[PDB]
Design a binder for this molecule. Structure first.
Ligand SMILES: CC(=O)C[C@H](c1ccccc1)c1c(O)c2ccccc2oc1=O
Ligand SMILES: CCCCCCCCCCCCCC(=O)O
Ligand SMILES: CCCCCCCCCCCCCC(=O)O
Ligand SMILES: CCCCCCCCCCCCCC(=O)O
Ligand SMILES: CCCCCCCCCCCCCC(=O)O
Length: 582
């Protein structure tokens, strides 16, 4: 208890310490140059080593909050660069750290991070490994100031491994670009999934978040007793509140406490944690969050005894409605690791609605008896959408699946900008690639994890620049209704076709040389524009026009005179297409 900074140095070790301190300063000091933060991290590291040698030395006795805040207040250009943030230095703890948190900028004005050429990256990696890796760690942390530093650190070690492996290969590019791409997607998805959990907490409140956490922990930890899940759900909520406010030291400490609690009580929680509970303090929390679902106990009774068929259902409910509803959710969820969390919550809200209505009626048991009937169609709707979409994904490419989604979603919401329709259809295509490789036992949770992210992204974007009442309705819907609401969108009956623009459907020989990704984006853009222009086109008409386009590109990219034929065969393509459509 003597030196917080000594204790975290000894626990983390110097290399992790230095990294996290760099991430933390970069999350706060987003416009400070790399060399200035490196010098702060080395001074903080020197000071922490005085506390490691003497837990009683000067200032070693201070809160990490206090030490962190004082270091920020030694920044010479604090007022010049960050303006009103420098006024936090005029306060004392805990007001100062509160004031610093109040001034973390969610979207700094920083240019997109452009990935250098593989050979350039590998020369840089070989020439100064430490500086190469620390600099991009800085670039990411300063652009992602709420991304949990220990997890940003876990990604950085995977990036290091990819460089170490691939800067061996003869084709550096063919090894490295696929590992970097997958790491980036997992990075972005991890950050999204955190933002989703903060939106549940922040937009729907503590009850909705705790319902969400009971279901998810009950699927993960099915041998856990309900009181043990209730306890974990309380602690989860404080971790997420702090993490959501973006207070790294408070969040880190609530996580370490919960990760120590879980590891002291494995036999009450899960047989899947032995691995995770061997790992250092730094990762242990993170390993737990990733653990595989435990096998559920054999010989579980059906839910009907307690929830459905018992005398005492209305009595037990009315005593403590949230506690009984929480029990139902735990019993349902621990039996159905194959259900989405949201599906389980839709069932618990149906059960709740039933008991509200049935417990007031003449024959309560007559009324609440039939409830499992209303559950079947709730379960079947997401299972059938997944079946139908994965069948379509299997029939078509990943790429032609995307094109099918672009036609579908453009006809439903043609007021959405082209670039966004292309990025939503392309991301949805990627959810089909990822989750259709699961067996149906694991599809619904996969689809939930990745669709909720796409839908949060879409709703954030739409809140900033709204274009459709129907999307506002779906985005402001209840947590359980959002995805069904988007699923219920029909073809827009009222949309005014977009006016013909020859420029939009004119191609050049440039298309032949473009990268695959970029060629696919140029064609998917034109397909959206075709649909905004001919929204009544049938799947036969659009398919006819797209195959003529495809024959036209295959003809014109192999022609003696590329440009002439792109121009002349282009005018014919446009004319035939207009006549055939609308
Ligand atoms: C996506 C996973 O469900 C993460 C999980 C969780 C579950 C429900 C709501 C929030 C988060 C999760 C944690 O984030 C966690 C963090 C620290 C310590 C233990 C944890 O256990 C966990 O299951
Ligand atoms: C201690 C945990 C008690 C949890 C309360 C369970 C209530 C489940 C009812 C369904 C409400 C789901 C929340 C939502 O509307 O998003
Ligand atoms: C399989 C990905 C292709 C994209 C669109 C298909 C969406 C299927 C909806 C699945 C819903 C699961 C979560 C829920 O219970 O609402
Ligand atoms: C402006 C975005 C396009 C509108 C569609 C939003 C994305 C679809 C999300 C729901 C998809 C679930 C599968 C479905 O039922 O189509
Ligand atoms: C009315 C103007 C008509 C012009 C042609 C429209 C072009 C849209 C084509 C997109 C089809 C891509 C399929 C493929 O990959 O080959």
């Amino acid at each position: 208890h003597k030196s917080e900074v000594a204790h975290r140095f000894k626990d983390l070790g110097e290399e992790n310490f230095k990294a996290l301190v760099l991430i933390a300063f970069a999350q706060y000091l987003q416009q400070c140059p790399f060399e200035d933060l490196v010098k702060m991290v080395n001074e903080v590291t020197e000071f922490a080593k005085t506390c490691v040698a003497d837990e009683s030395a000067e200032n070693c006795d201070k809160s990490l909050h206090t030490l962190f805040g004082d270091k920020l207040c030694t920044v010479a250009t604090l007022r010049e660069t960050y303006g009103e943030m420098a006024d936090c230095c005029a306060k004392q703890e805990p007001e100062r750290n509160e004031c610093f948190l109040q001034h973390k900028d969610d979207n700094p004005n920083l240019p997109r991070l452009v990935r250098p050429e593989p050979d350039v990256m590998c020369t840089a990696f070989h020439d100064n490994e430490e500086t190469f890796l620390k600099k991009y760690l800085y670039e990411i942390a300063r652009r992602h100031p709420y991304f949990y530093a220990p997890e940003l650190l876990y990604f950085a070690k995977r990036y290091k491994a990819a460089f170490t492996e691939c800067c061996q290969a003869a084709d550096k590019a063919a090894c490295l670009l696929p590992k970097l791409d997958e790491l980036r997607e997992e990075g972005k998805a991890s950050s999204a999934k955190q933002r989703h959990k903060c939106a549940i907490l922040q937009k729907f409140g503590e009850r909705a978040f705790k319902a969400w956490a009971v279901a998810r922990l009950s699927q993960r930890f099915p041998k856990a007793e309900f009181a043990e899940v209730s306890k974990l759900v309380t602690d989860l909520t404080k971790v997420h509140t702090e993490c959501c406010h973006g207070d790294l030291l408070e969040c880190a400490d609530d996580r370490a406490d919960l990760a120590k609690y879980i590891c002291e009580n494995q036999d009450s929680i899960s047989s899947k944690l032995k691995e995770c509970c061997e790992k250092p303090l730094l990762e242990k929390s993170h390993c737990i969050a990733e653990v595989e679902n435990d096998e559920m106990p054999a010989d579980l009774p059906s839910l009907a005894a307690d929830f459905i068929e018992s005398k005492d259902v209305c009595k037990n409910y009315a005593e403590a409605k949230d506690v009984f509803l929480g029990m139902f959710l735990y019993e349902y969820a621990r039996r159905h690791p194959d259900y989405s969390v949201v599906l389980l919550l839709r069932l618990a809200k149906t059960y709740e609605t039933t008991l509200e209505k049935c417990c007031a009626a003449a024959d309560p048991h007559e009324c609440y008896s039939k409830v499992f009937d209303e559950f079947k169609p709730l379960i079947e709707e997401p299972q059938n959408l997944i079946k139908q979409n994965c069948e379509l994904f299997e029939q078509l490419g990943e790429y032609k699946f995307q094109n099918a989604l672009l036609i579908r979603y453009t006809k439903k919401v043609p007021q959405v900008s082209t670039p966004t329709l292309v990025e939503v259809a392309r991301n949805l295509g990627k959810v089909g690639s990822k989750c259709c490789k699961h067996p149906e036992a694991k599809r619904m949770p996969c689809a939930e994890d990745y669709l909720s992210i796409v839908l949060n992204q879409l709703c954030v974007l739409h809140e900033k620049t709204p274009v459709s009442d129907r999307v506002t309705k779906c985005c402001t819907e209840s947590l359980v209704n959002r995805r069904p609401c988007f699923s219920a969108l029909e073809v827009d009956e009222t949309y005014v076709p977009k006016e013909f623009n020859a420029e939009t459907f004119t191609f050049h020989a440039d298309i032949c040389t473009l990268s695959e990704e970029e060629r696919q984006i140029k064609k998917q853009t034109a397909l959206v524009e075709l649909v905004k222009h001919k929204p009544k086109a049938t799947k036969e008409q659009l398919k006819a026009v797209m195959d003529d386009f495809s024959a036209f590109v295959e003809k014109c990219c192999k022609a003696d005179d590329k440009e002439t034929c792109f121009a002349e065969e282009g005018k014919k393509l446009i004319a035939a297409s207009q006549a055939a459509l609308g």
